[PDB]
C-alpha cells in the first residue's frame, strides 16, 4: 500500500536494521556449519576393501 509505505518512511531505520540482523544470523549459520564440518583439508576416500 502506497499510503502505508509513505507512513513507514517516517519511522526510521528499524525496517533496515532488522534485515541487517537477520542477514547476520543467516551468514552465521553457514559459518557454524563450515566450522563444524569443514575441518579436514583433503577429501580422503576409503579403500575398496
Amino acid at each position: 500500500s502506497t499510503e502505508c509505505s509513505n507512513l513507514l518512511l517516517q519511522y526510521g531505520s528499524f525496517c533496515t536494521q532488522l534485515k541487517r540482523a537477520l542477514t547476520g544470523i543467516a551468514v552465521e549459520q553457514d559459518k557454524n556449519t563450515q566450522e563444524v564440518f569443514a575441518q579436514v583439508k583433503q577429501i580422503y576416500k576409503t579403500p575398496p576393501i
Binding site: 519511522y11 526510521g12 528499524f14 536494521q17 540482523a21 575441518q39
Partner: protein, 49 residues
C-alpha cells in the same frame, strides 16, 4: 512530544538490547581467550587442534 519520546525510547531500547547480546558474544570469546592463555601459554596442551 509523546510520539517523539515513544519513538526515541524505542530506538534506544533496541540499541541497548543489541549491545547486551553483543556483550554476551564478546564475553564468550573472552572466556575462551582466558582458557587459551591459561593452557597454551602456561603449559603444554594434549588437546588436538
Amino acid at each position: 512530544i509523546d510520539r517523539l519520546i515513544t519513538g526515541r525510547l524505542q530506538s534506544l531500547q533496541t540499541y541497548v538490547t543489541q549491545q547486551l547480546i553483543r556483550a554476551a558474544e564478546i564475553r564468550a570469546s573472552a572466556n575462551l581467550a582466558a582458557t587459551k592463555m591459561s593452557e597454551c601459554v602456561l603449559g603444554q596442551s594434549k588437546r588436538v587442534d
